[PDB]
């Protein structure tokens, strides 16, 4: 439990998780891609909407 050192009043510094990865990820690997992902059919990944 590290609550007395990480937590600060009025929000904290951003800590992120990924919502989706396309393929099964092989052991000991990570994705740091910050590219804008899209769920619908309409094109994105370079367009914000």
């Amino acid at each position, epitope marked *: 439990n590290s609550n*007395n*050192l990480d937590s*600060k*009043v*009025g929000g904290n*510094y951003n800590y992120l998780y990924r919502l989706f990865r396309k393929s099964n990820l092989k052991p000991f690997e990570r994705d740091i891609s910050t590219e804008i992902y899209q769920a619908g059919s309409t094109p994105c990944n370079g367009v914000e909407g």
Partner: antibody
Framework: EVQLVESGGGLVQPGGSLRLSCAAS????????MHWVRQAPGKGLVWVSR????????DYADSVKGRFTISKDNAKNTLFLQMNSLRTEDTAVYYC???????????????????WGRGTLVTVSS | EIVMTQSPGTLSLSPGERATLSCRAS???????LAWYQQEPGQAPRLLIH???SRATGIPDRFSGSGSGTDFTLIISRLEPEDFAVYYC?????FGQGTRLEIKR
């Protein structure tokens, strides 16, 4: 004995900059978490700022946000705080205070203050 | 965000007879991490208890109070002529308004 000497402060024009020092004698100014507290004249005290052991991360309240910057100088043994655009309501007395840590297998601060040094009066008026 | 109300505002009691002080938080439970601070108006604040259960060394054994979760109560076993001070309460992020302990006459 364990004591913190507060230096700086005084008269300052509104919109100006001010800068405070806090030298720590009697204990190790390396691992203990540091806090800065203000107290308005004839009013209650509110929390100002917090800094950890290394000094990368800092914690500021909304009123002091964007104007106050705290820095812990472990090697030089001093707690520092720089203000700019000091508003009129900031006229108060400033205390440099410590935050307790067990210093066990983890530092693990507790967010309670141990010793309060004598604070300095900062007055800003036209 | 978090607001502490110390009730009541003025506690006027005779020097001989005891006193108690109750502080009311606003929301949530902070693992019972709370502290009391006694402030003689000319002097600086000083801690009385830490973690709301244990009492810091040097503080007189009279000062002993405890609570859990919702409301935090701090009981003073007897009374001596030093309670001319404002008693504040320091939570995770904010300080309470405080209470003032007067002498009856």
């Amino acid at each position: 004995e364990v004591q913190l000497v507060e230096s700086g402060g005084g008269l300052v024009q509104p919109g100006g900059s001010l800068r405070l020092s806090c030298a720590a004698s009697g204990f190790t100014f390396s691992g203990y978490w540091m806090h800065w507290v203000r107290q308005a004249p004839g009013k209650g005290l509110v929390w100002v700022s917090r800094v950890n052991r290394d000094g990368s991360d800092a914690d500021y309240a909304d009123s002091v946000k964007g104007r106050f910057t705290i820095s812990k100088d472990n090697a030089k043994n001093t707690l520092f705080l720089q203000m700019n655009s000091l508003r009129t309501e900031d006229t108060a007395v400033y205390y440099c205070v410590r935050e307790a840590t067990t210093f066990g297998v983890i530092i693990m601060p507790e967010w309670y203050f141990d010793l309060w040094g004598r604070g300095t009066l900062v007055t800003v008026s036209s | 965000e978090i607001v502490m109300t110390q009730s009541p505002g003025t506690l006027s009691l005779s020097p001989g007879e005891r006193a108690t002080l109750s502080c009311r938080a606003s929301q949530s439970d902070s693992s019972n991490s709370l502290a009391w601070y006694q402030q003689e108006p000319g002097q600086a604040p000083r801690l009385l208890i830490h973690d709301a259960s244990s009492r810091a060394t040097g503080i007189p054994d009279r000062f002993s109070g405890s609570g859990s979760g919702t409301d935090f109560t701090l009981i003073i076993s007897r009374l001596e002529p030093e309670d001319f001070a404002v008693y504040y309460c320091q939570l995770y992020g904010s300080f309470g308004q405080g209470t003032r302990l007067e002498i009856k006459r």
